[PDB]
RNA sequence: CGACUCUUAGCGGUGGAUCACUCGGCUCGUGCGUCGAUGAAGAACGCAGCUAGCUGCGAGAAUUAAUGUGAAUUGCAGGACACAUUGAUCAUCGACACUUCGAACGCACUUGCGGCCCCGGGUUCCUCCCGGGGCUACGCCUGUCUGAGCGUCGCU
RNA sequence: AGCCUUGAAGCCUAGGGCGCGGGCCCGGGUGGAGCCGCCGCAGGUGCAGAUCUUGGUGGUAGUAGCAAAUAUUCAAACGAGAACUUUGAAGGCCGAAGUGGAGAAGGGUUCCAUGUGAACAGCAGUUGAACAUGGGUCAGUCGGUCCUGAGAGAUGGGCGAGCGCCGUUCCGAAGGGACGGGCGAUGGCCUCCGUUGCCCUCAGCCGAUCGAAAGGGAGUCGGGUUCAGAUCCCCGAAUCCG
RNA sequence: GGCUAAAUACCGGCACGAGACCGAUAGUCAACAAGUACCGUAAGGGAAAGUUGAAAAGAACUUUGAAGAGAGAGUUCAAG
RNA sequence: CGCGACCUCAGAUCAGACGUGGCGACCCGCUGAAUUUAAGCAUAUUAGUCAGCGGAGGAAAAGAAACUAACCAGGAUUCCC
C-alpha cells in the first residue's frame, strides 16, 4: 500500500517522500508515483540509484 | 566469498540478518542494473545472490528451530509444528504403550497356558 | 599461500524467540 | 468494461503475457520440436469466455 | 426474429469463475456452482459422466502434497533423523 | 540367460531408460575401453571418459593412431569431442565431431583423487572375482 | 497444317497411401496397499539472465539444506574473490521451507469491514496514526470457571 | 548350415513368362534394412457398393459472382511498384433524432509510437483494429466501498434414510453494551488524572449476513501539461470527514 | 449385549514383470506443449498432429530481382 | 431474607482433545428405474441391476449356533469344487 511504499523507499535511499500515487498495470504490475520534498532532487536521487 | 552453508553454521543470529541484509540490497542494486544495461556477469549474479539469500534463511530457520526442540523437549504440550507429522491416521493410532495392554485376565491365561514347544515321533 | 590453500548440547537462549520467552516470564 | 474487479483485471493480466512468440533460442535447444506458439490468441477471432 | 437479431440483446452474464473450481461455472443468481457445487461443503459429482469424474479427479492437478507422501511411505515416514554426516 | 525377475529385458524399456537417464546415470553409460598398456597397469578394461582423458578413435572416418585430448562430454547427446575430431561448416568456421565414446580407446588418464579411488574399486573386485574362480 | 479431345508411356507436380521403424497403448500377473484443521484433493496467481507452452517449484519460488556421486550444465552468454574436504552435475531425500482460494475457520467474498493482545516507528506518558506478529469458525468429549430455576431439599 | 548393404520390405514398369483362375515367378528402375519357402498352429484374414467412415482430388469453372444506402477529379511527395497511402486544391455527402462530441453493458490492449508488407483485411495497398518491437490507465473530493429495495440466506426449531430441505421471528436463557456510583491493581506531564478487573445500576428494538458502478449516500473547482492519462499529474484556489 | 486373525475381493493408488495383442484412420480420446486447442451461458462436448541425416555437416561465396523466388557453387553415399 | 447441598440446564477466544473434506477399483448400509424378454401386454423378466445418498479399510463384511440334521450323526465365519 501506499503507506507501505512510502516507508520502504525512505529506508532504502534515505530520502524524504512528499506524497505516493500508484496504479496497477495491464500486465499486473503495480507502479507507484513517488514524489520526494522540495528539498530533495529526484535526478540527482536517481543517480544515486543508478537509474541515470 | 561464496557463501557455503557450512561456513554458517555456528554464528549468531543477528550476525547472520546482518548478513542477509548485504544480500538483500546486493540483489536490489543487481535489479537495478537489470534493467540500466548491466554487463552479462552482473545479470548472472542475480542468480548466484538469489540462492545465497536462501541459504542464509535456510540456516537461520534451521537454527531456529534446532533450539526449540530443544527447548521443549522435557515438556508435555508442543508447538504443534514440533509434534511428529506421519500421517493423520497414523497420529490417531493407540500408542506404543496402550497396544501392549493386557487384562489381567488375558495376562494370566498366558503365565498358566502358555503355547508350547513339541514334535510328534514320525 | 593461495597455491598452497586452493589445493587442500543445550538451548541457546539467544535462537529462542521474543514471544516464547515473553510467555515464559 | 472500464469497471473492473481485480480479480478480472488479473485474469486479463496473465492472458496478455501468454500472448507472445516463443523465443527464438528456443528452436535451437538439443530436442525441441516446438516451431511456435500455437497457443496465441486474438481478441477478435477468439474470445476469453469471461 | 428469435434467430440472429435476438442474439444482439445478450449482454448480461449468468455465471462467472468458481473461487473453489475456478471454471465459469458460479451462477451469480443462484449463487452456485454448476460444476462443482460451491459453496456445497462437498464436491459435486456424479457417475453418469465418468468423463466429467477424470477430468477433475485426484492426479489430474498438481498433487503438491499427496505426491511427497509416496516417497515418504518408502521410508516409513521417518522423521526427525538424517543421514550420517561427512 | 537373465534370470533375474526384477530387470526388464523388454526392448521398449531398455531404450526408454537409456535416452531418458539422469546426468549421473549417462556418465557410466559413457565409458570407453583403455589401451592395451592401461588395462595392464591398473588392470581395469573400462573408464567412464573424462575430460582431458587423452584417446585414439577406433571407428569412423576419424579413426586412426592420432591422439588428442577430450575437450567436452557432451553427455546430452551422448557425444564427446576431441582435439582434431572437427570439420568445417558452410561459412568456413570449424566445428567438433561427436563421437561416441564406445569408439575410442583411453591413452592417458586424467587422474585425480577420485579417478584413483574408482581405479583401485575396479582393480579389487576384478581380483576378488579371479581369485574365486581359482 | 494447327488447336481441342482420347489412349499409352517418360519426366514433373498435387496428394500422403504403402513399407520399414515405435521413449505409446492394451491385456494379464506380482508386491505394496500410504490423503486431510500439523490444513488434503482441486483451483488461482506468481517464480528462470535471456522463457510463451509443457515441466518443476512457492516470495528461500526451473529451487535451500543434508547425504551419495564425482566433473559438468549447455540453445547463447556468464563465472560471483562459483567448481575437486572451499565438490560441478545428477540422484536420493530424513532437515528447513511451502503465496491466494479451497472441508477453509473473525464476518463477507468487493483483494470490503472488524475485534482482542503484544511489539516497533512517528511526538512526546496516554491518546492518535502507520507497520509487524499472534489470536478471534461449527459441532463435540473430559475437566474448569461463572451462573439460572415458585426443580428436590437442609440450616436459618 | 534359407535370402539380404555385392542391397530387405515397399513402390513403378509400351520387359520375359507361368496358371482355367484366385495369383505367382523372373528382368529393369527407385528404395535404404530387413525378409521369405516348406510342415504345423492361430486369426481383429480378402471390398464396388452400405444417402458406409476418415482423408484427398475432380468436372462444373476462370463460371455464379465481388450491383442496398447520389461521387469523384487535378497536381505533388514517398516508393521497385499508386484508381485505393499522405499533403494541397476542387466537387459532394452526413445536415444537430448526424456519418458530430461523450458514456453504460460487453470486449480486453483492439489504445499510442516505430517497423514489415510473409499470411490475413473476398481488387490493390507505400495502408489496417493484421503481424513485430516497445510504451500507456496516477484520486480523501469521480465510482466501488456503506444503506436498504424486490429478494436471497444461516443459527434456534421442525422435517428428513440421507447428501440435506423448510423456515427468517416463527417452539430460543438471542444484550458482551452504557452516563453514573462503589471496591481494589497498576501506572504517567506520579502533583492528581488515566487505564484496567469486579460489583451496583440502567438498557426493547424483535433479528446473523447478503442485495443496486442508473435508487439513498459529507466533500473539487479553474488553468496548464502527453505520443498515448488526467475534476487523478503540475500550478492556483477551496472544501468534507476523522 | 460384545470382540476376533487366516484362507477371499480389488478396471482407483505406488512400484514392478511379462505377452502367439495393436502398430499412428490401429492401439487409450490422448506415441506429439491432450483432457490440450476449439465449441457451448452452463451441465458438458472435445480433435488434428510421429519419421532430414550416421553426423547439422542445415547450403559460405558469386550473380538477376524490391522480395518471394531463381542460376551457379558447396556439404553428404544420397538433397533424385 | 440469607447461606449450603443435589438435580436439570446454560455461557465462555476457558485447559486439553477429537469430527468435517477428498479418493472411491474392491467393501458395508440404503434407496432404486425403465429400455429389454414374454414375438402384443398389465404379474413376471430386466433387477435388487443402472442412476441417486451415506460410511469405511488394506482389505471390508461375516464369525464362535436360539445351526445342520434325523445319521453309527456332524460342529464358528469366509472362499473353491
Ligand atoms: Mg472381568
Ligand atoms: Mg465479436
Ligand atoms: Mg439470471
Ligand atoms: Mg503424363
Ligand atoms: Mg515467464
Ligand atoms: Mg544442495
Ligand atoms: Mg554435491
Ligand atoms: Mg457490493
Ligand atoms: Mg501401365
Ligand atoms: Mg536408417
Ligand atoms: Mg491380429
Ligand atoms: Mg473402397
Ligand atoms: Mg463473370
Ligand atoms: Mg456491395
Ligand atoms: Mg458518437
Ligand atoms: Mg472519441
Ligand atoms: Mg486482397
Ligand atoms: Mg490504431
Ligand atoms: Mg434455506
Ligand atoms: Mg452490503
Ligand atoms: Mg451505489
Ligand atoms: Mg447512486
Ligand atoms: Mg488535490
Ligand atoms: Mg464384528
Ligand atoms: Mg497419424
Ligand atoms: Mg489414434
Ligand atoms: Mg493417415
Ligand atoms: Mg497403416
Ligand atoms: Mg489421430
Ligand atoms: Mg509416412
Ligand atoms: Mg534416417
Ligand atoms: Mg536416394
Ligand atoms: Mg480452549
Ligand atoms: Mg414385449
Ligand atoms: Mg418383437
Ligand atoms: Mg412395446
Ligand atoms: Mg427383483
Ligand atoms: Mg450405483
Ligand atoms: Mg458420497
Ligand atoms: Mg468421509
Ligand atoms: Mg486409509
Ligand atoms: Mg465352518
Ligand atoms: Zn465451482
Known amino acids: 500500500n501506499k503507506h507501505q511504499i512510502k516507508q520502504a523507499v525512505k529506508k532504502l535511499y534515505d530520502i524524504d517522500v512528499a506524497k505516493v500515487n500508484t496504479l496497477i498495470r495491464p500486465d499486473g504490475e503495480k507502479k507507484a508515483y513517488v514524489r520526494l520534498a522540495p528539498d530533495y532532487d529526484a535526478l540527482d536521487v536517481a543517480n544515486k540509484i543508478g537509474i541515470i | 566469498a561464496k557463501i557455503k552453508a557450512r561456513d554458517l553454521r555456528g554464528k549468531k543470529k543477528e550476525e547472520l540478518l546482518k548478513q542477509l541484509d548485504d544480500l538483500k540490497v546486493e540483489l536490489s542494486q543487481l535489479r537495478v542494473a537489470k534493467v540500466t544495461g548491466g554487463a552479462a556477469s552482473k545479470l548472472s549474479k542475480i542468480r548466484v545472490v538469489r540462492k545465497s539469500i536462501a541459504r542464509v534463511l535456510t540456516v537461520i530457520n534451521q537454527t531456529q528451530k534446532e533450539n526449540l526442540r530443544k527447548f521443549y523437549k522435557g515438556k508435555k504440550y508442543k508447538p504443534l509444528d514440533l509434534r511428529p507429522k506421519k500421517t493423520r491416521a497414523m497420529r490417531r493410532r493407540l500408542n506404543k504403550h496402550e497396544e501392549s495392554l493386557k487384562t489381567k485376565k488375558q495376562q494370566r491365561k498366558e503365565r498358566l497356558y502358555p503355547l508350547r514347544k513339541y514334535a510328534v515321533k514320525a | 599461500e593461495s597455491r598452497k590453500r586452493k589445493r587442500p548440547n543445550d538451548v541457546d537462549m539467544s535462537w529462542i524467540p521474543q514471544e516464547t520467552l515473553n510467555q515464559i516470564n | 468494461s472500464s469497471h473492473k474487479t481485480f480479480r478480472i483485471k488479473r485474469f486479463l493480466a496473465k492472458k496478455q503475457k501468454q500472448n507472445r512468440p516463443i523465443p527464438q533460442w528456443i528452436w535451437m535447444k538439443t530436442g525441441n520440436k516446438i516451431r511456435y506458439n500455437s497457443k496465441r490468441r486474438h481478441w477478435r477471432r477468439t474470445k476469453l469466455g469471461l | ?86 | 540367460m537373465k534370470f533375474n525377475p526384477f530387470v526388464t529385458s523388454d526392448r521398449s524399456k531398455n531404450r526408454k531408460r537409456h535416452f531418458n537417464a539422469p546426468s549421473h546415470i549417462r556418465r557410466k553409460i559413457m565409458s570407453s575401453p583403455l589401451s592395451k598398456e592401461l588395462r595392464q597397469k591398473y588392470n581395469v578394461r573400462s573408464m567412464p571418459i573424462r575430460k582431458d582423458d587423452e584417446v585414439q578413435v577406433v571407428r569412423g572416418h576419424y579413426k586412426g593412431q592420432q591422439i588428442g585430448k577430450v575437450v567436452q562430454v557432451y553427455r546430452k547427446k551422448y557425444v564427446i569431442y576431441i582435439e582434431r575430431v572437427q570439420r568445417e561448416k558452410a561459412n568456413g568456421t570449424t566445428v567438433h565431431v561427436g563421437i561416441h565414446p564406445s569408439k575410442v580407446v583411453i591413452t592417458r588418464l586424467k587422474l585425480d583423487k577420485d579417478r584413483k579411488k574408482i581405479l583401485e574399486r575396479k582393480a579389487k573386485s576384478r581380483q576378488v572375482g579371479k581369485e574365486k574362480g581359482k
Do not use: D
Open chain 5, 1 to 86: 426474429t428469435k434467430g440472429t437479431s435476438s442474439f444482439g440483446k445478450r449482454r448480461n452474464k449468468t455465471h462467472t469463475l468458481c473461487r473453489r473450481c475456478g471454471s465459469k461455472a458460479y451462477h451469480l443468481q443462484k449463487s452456485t456452482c454448476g460444476k462443482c457445487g460451491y459453496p456445497a461443503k462437498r464436491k459435486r459429482k456424479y457417475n453418469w459422466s465418468a468423463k466429467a469424474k477424470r477430468r477433475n479427479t485426484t492426479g489430474t492437478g498438481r498433487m503438491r502434497h499427496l505426491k511427497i507422501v509416496y516417497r515418504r511411505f518408502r521410508h516409513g515416514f521417518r522423521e526427525g533423523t538424517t543421514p550420517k554426516p561427512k
